[PDB]
Structure 1
Amino acid sequence: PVKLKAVVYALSPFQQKIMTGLWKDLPEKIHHKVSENWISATLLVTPVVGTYWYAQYFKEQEKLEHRF
């Protein structure tokens, strides 16, 4: 058991609004999500999208060259 010194104040769940906080400070929420995760999103989408479009391009060149 860890020895902990702290003071905690809590409010009853029936004395606060439960759902309005979902849409509070939304521009901050969208800004934080993008600004911290854009590199992560790029590292995940770019190789799957780059490989896919290359394969489509290759199949188009391979099909056309086999024609007459």
Structure 2
Amino acid sequence: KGFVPMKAVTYGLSPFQQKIMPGLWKDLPTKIHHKVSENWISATLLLGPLVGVYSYVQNYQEKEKLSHRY
């Protein structure tokens, strides 16, 4: 149910020997470039068909509004 026989060596430090907070604002320019050069075909597939449909509706409704005016 939960047993896999194994062989490894692990080392570990204490919580009160390390710096807890400063590893968040570490290299935020490098962190941002990694996320957007790897997830730019998943947002071109999420926002793409929505920006292109909203452009069609606003153009359709601006040509039947100027055709009813006398």
TM-score, normalised by the number of residues in structure 1: 0.86
In structure 2, stretches of 5+ residues that fail to align are: none
- Structure 1 or 2: more strand by fraction: 2
Number of aligned pairs? Answer: 68
Tell me what 1:3 maps to: 5
Aligned identity (percent) is 72
Tell me which structure has the larger Cα radius of gyration.
Answer: 2
Structure 1 runs of 4+ with >2 Å offset = none
Tell me what 1:49 maps to: 51
- Aligned with 1:66 (options 60, 65, 68): 68
Tell me what 1:27 maps to: 29
RMSD across aligned C-alpha pairs, in angstroms? 1.2
